[PDB]
Each structure stands twice: as structure tokens, then as C-alpha cells.
């Protein structure tokens, strides 16, 4: 059997449960849409490609509706149309791969009325961010509690994955399919509490972020997206405007200039 779970407005619904007549037959996803810009030079062969990108793709679910009678069929059609088509994006996933969800917008569908009470349909969802993601962030206990398989191994059972650190040098594991970069409108939060002048070095990616003022243990430095904040106040003028990105796999982090440092990484994994 199969089902489709939709998280919207803070509530999780099952497609086969909200509408008893509806039953999901099959679930599939489109391939990543690699978009590329090519430039041609006269007198030379081939093309020069620009930076590649990933266009929004399509998550499809073919299903059927078996109503009790004609009024039930029309009522179910109206209910499905009302429920599916909201004005804001919502998350979806399936029981086959429960550990990964897609933030989608509904696509137009058409009911293929076969009989007076039976109608087949194929619900398509536009994943407009170009990637899938885990059901929660790194600090979310739900993320490592349902399932996550990578290279034939389950990440929900690994005990060496930590995202809150107290030392000055450590390693952070990004289990996503590609590098996490705030400049790409990805979600990445780094919360730090220490004493002194902080300086964070990502040796794996060779990145650096420095704050040019003294810090106290009761002052929390939070780097969210492209903005650093101290006690929820933008202090970008006193930094080097550094951006910290997490590469695939293990990233080695070194903290210098402070003591008694507590640092936490909160970000969702990115899957292609």
C-alpha cells in the first residue's frame, strides 16, 4: 500500500485518510532539471557553459477516487479541489521514503471520470526550490528519528553526529546531497556564546568569519542566512561580512579568539 502525507498550516494530514474514497496508487518524482547557459565563440568548436542551476521539478502521485454515488463524487471533487489548492506552499512526503519531504505548490490536475462513481487522477506538485530536504533541521530530534539512508547506511542510528559543541576545534557532518550555502537562499543558523573576540574558520571550505568586538557569555551571536546578529541586533558593520558554508560530508571547524565557547548549528539537509 501507499499514502501521501501533507503538512500544511501546522497540521499533518493523510491523503487516504482525509478523503476515504481517495487511494494513492503510485508515487514518483521527476529528475533534477539541470539548466545551463551556453556561449558560442566563432572559429572554435563546441560551447562554453555557464554556472549550472537546478530548475523546479515535479513530484507526481497517480491515484483514483471511488465515490459512493454521483453526489458523493461531486462533493469529493469539490473537497479535493478546496483542500489541495491553497495560496501558500506546503510540505509533502510519502511512506516509501518517510525521511524526506518536498516543499511544493500544487499543479493543475484533471479528473478522468471513467464511470459514474470512479475517477482517476494524477496530482502533480511543483517543487520550486529545486531540491528536497529532511523532515527537520539538524537540531530537530525528529530528523534523526524516522529514517535516513545514505550510501546503504542508516543515519538515524549513527551516534557520532553532534551539532552542539563546547570545544574550539571540531567536525560538523552535512549529510545533504550538496553544499549548504546561505548565499543560495539556503537555511543555516549558527548560534554562539563565548567570551572574547570570536573567529570561526571552516578549514574544509577555507572560509572565515570574524567579529571585531569583545563578547560576553550572556551575549549570543547568531549568524542566520547572510546576517549576523548580537542579541537580535544587526551588527554587520563590525564584522568582515564573512559567510560560512557547509560542504558535503565532514567540515573541520576551528574557533579562535574566545574561551568557554558553546556553538550550535541548526540547518536542514539538502537532497537533489
Amino acid at each position: 500500500m501507499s499514502d501521501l502525507f501533507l503538512e500544511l498550516n501546522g497540521k499533518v494530514h493523510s491523503l487516504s485518510e482525509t478523503f476515504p474514497g481517495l487511494s494513492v496508487q503510485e508515487v514518483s518524482r521527476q529528475s533534477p532539471q539541470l539548466s545551463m547557459e551556453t556561449a558560442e565563440i566563432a572559429g572554435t568548436d563546441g560551447v562554453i557553459p555557464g554556472m549550472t542551476q537546478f530548475k523546479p521539478f515535479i513530484f507526481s502521485a497517480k491515484c483514483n477516487l471511488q465515490a459512493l454515488d454521483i453526489p458523493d463524487y461531486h462533493l469529493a471533487v469539490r473537497e479535493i479541489y478546496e483542500f489541495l489548492f491553497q495560496r501558500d506552499s506546503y510540505y509533502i512526503w510519502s511512506d516509501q521514503m518517510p525521511g524526506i519531504r518536498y516543499e511544493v505548490h500544487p499543479k493543475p490536475v484533471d479528473f478522468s471520470r471513467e464511470s459514474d462513481r470512479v475517477g482517476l487522477l494524477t496530482i502533480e506538485f511543483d517543487v520550486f526550490k529545486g531540491y528536497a530536504e529532511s523532515r527537520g533541521t539538524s537540531l530537530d530530534p525528529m530528523t534523526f528519528e524516522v529514517d535516513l539512508w545514505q550510501m546503504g547506511m542508516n543515519l538515524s542510528n549513527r551516534d557520532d553526529l553532534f551539532y552542539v559543541f563546547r570545544e574550539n576545534t571540531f567536525r560538523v557532518y552535512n549529510a545533504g546531497s550538496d553544499r549548504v550555502n546561505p548565499l543560495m537562499r539556503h537555511e543555516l543558523d549558527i548560534a554562539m556564546t563565548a567570551n572574547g573576540t570570536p573567529t570561526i574558520h571552516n578549514l574544509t571550505t577555507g572560509e572565515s568569519f570574524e567579529y571585531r568586538k569583545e563578547l560576553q557569555k550572556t551575549d549570543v551571536l547568531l549568524l542566520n542566512n547572510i546576517y549576523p546578529l548580537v542579541n537580535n541586533r544587526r551588527v554587520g558593520k563590525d564584522t568582515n561580512h564573512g559567510i560560512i558554508t557547509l560542504e558535503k560530508g565532514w567540515n573541520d571547524f576551528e574557533i579562535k579568539g574566545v574561551t568557554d565557547v558553546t556553538i550550535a548549528f541548526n540547518f536542514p539537509f539538502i537532497y537533489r
Binding site: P182, L183, R185, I226, Y227, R234, V235, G236, K237, H241
Partner: protein
């Protein structure tokens, strides 16, 4: 109504008047180096120091910008100039730069990066 917020130097002008309000406002902006912003019918005149206010918002590549263009022109790149002051009363009786009590040649330091690029002489007779 008008309000002034800033410090501006003194400018010497000839026969001020005989113009509409907008012409005089533009003259003030061009001469005193002010910036005009209007709250409906109330015109505030700032200077460069008091006009711009620093903000933490930033423009980042690949984050919130799509196309960035820079137009650079060096047709008027000049690092040297010669200027003449007023004219002496015995201008016809005198020869050369002696016709003016004030003759000066200004050379910008940027010549060290561009060499001598002297422009056509400008004359101020006041």
C-alpha cells in the same frame, strides 16, 4: 515652505532673481551642493553629511541581486589644467600671461597613475 538641515558655504552670484521657484531651487542645489527632498509641499534641503543614513541592509551577489552593470568612461580623464584670472587694464599694452594678474597651472596627483593629460584652458574673469 522650506527647511534647511546642514552646513553650506557662501556663494557669490550676479543679479539674483527674475526666475521661477524651481529655477532658483535648482540653482541652490547646483551651487551650494544641497540635496532636496519634499514632504508634499515642504521642501527639506540637506547636505551630503546629513542626507545619507547608514543601514545594515546589504546587497549580496547570488542572494538578492540578478544583474549588476558598471559603466566606465575615461574620455574626460584630465590631470592638468591651466587657468587665467581677471584681465589687467593694460591688457593690450602687455604680452602673454602678464595680461592677467592670476595665471595658475594645476596638476592632480593622479598624473602619477595616468601621466600628463592637460585639458583646454578655462578662464574666470572675476
Amino acid at each position: 515652505s522650506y527647511e534647511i538641515q546642514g552646513s553650506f558655504p557662501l556663494v557669490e552670484l550676479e543679479d539674483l532673481g527674475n526666475k521661477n521657484g524651481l529655477e532658483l531651487v535648482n540653482l541652490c542645489l547646483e551651487e551650494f551642493g544641497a540635496i532636496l527632498f519634499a514632504d508634499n509641499k515642504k521642501l527639506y534641503f540637506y547636505d551630503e553629511k546629513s542626507w545619507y543614513v547608514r543601514t545594515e541592509k546589504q546587497f549580496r551577489y547570488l542572494y538578492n541581486t540578478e544583474e549588476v552593470s558598471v559603466d566606465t568612461n575615461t574620455d574626460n580623464l584630465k590631470t592638468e589644467i591651466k587657468c587665467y584670472g581677471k584681465q589687467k587694464e593694460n591688457a593690450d599694452k602687455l604680452t602673454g600671461d602678464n595680461k592677467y594678474m592670476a595665471v595658475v597651472t594645476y596638476t592632480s596627483p593622479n598624473e602619477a597613475i595616468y601621466g600628463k593629460r592637460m585639458a583646454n584652458a578655462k578662464s574666470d574673469d572675476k
